[PDB]
Design a protein around this ligand. Sequence first.
Ligand SMILES: CN(C)c1cc2c(cc1Sc1nc3c(N)nccc3n1CCNCC(C)(C)C)OCO2
Length: 211
Amino acid sequence: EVETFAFQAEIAQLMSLIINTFYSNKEIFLRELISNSSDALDKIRYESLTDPSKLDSGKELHINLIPNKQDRTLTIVDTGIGMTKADLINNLGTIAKSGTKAFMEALQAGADISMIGQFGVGFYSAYLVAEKVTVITKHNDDEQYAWESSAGGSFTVRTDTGEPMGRGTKVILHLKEDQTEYLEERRIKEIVKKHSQFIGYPITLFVEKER
Ligand SMILES: CN(C)c1cc2c(cc1Sc1nc3c(N)nccc3n1CCNCC(C)(C)C)OCO2
């Protein structure tokens, strides 16, 4: 049911560096995730031009940001192309192995952590603000899956029984206790305005309900 996998060594090392670094400009995580969502939306849109049935699983292309102060979670949800089981357990890490290496070489050479996106490994900037990350994802060609990792060198994959989603990806950030500023409406708005103003899809920030 729940399978556990080891990260490749280079990715484990970058995750430890990110989760333990003293780096104050942590807000870039949201730019990186929104950008990843935007690429996923780009891909399903492009593919649907030659195969319109790929949108049977959902026509709306958007990004939602959903903070939850009770659970202390921030969720980025998109209706992009999603990820398969093969992506989650192996293929993404096969690609990220080289980008993770190049990024850590650049950090040693004096590059900034905010440049992580240029190396194709921006997803891991989520561990600037999160102690655990859960990814619920559904690709047209596969079943709905739940990926999860608290760093420490391993991650799990299981078939997801909640939701379902139709198509797309939810990144659930279980925030560190001292990073709850990223659950506030005004903070999230400021970050999106500064880093994601030109994203070509509707970004809807959900507001929380209790006064
Ligand atoms: C480091 N790294 C790449 C990564 C590792 C992960 C991970 C996600 C990602 S980044 C991401 N976010 C996505 C999203 N929101 N939707 C669909 C796919 C998404 N990918 C994968 C790349 N997509 C490229 C493409 C095909 C869109 C050009 O989850 C567990 O381990």
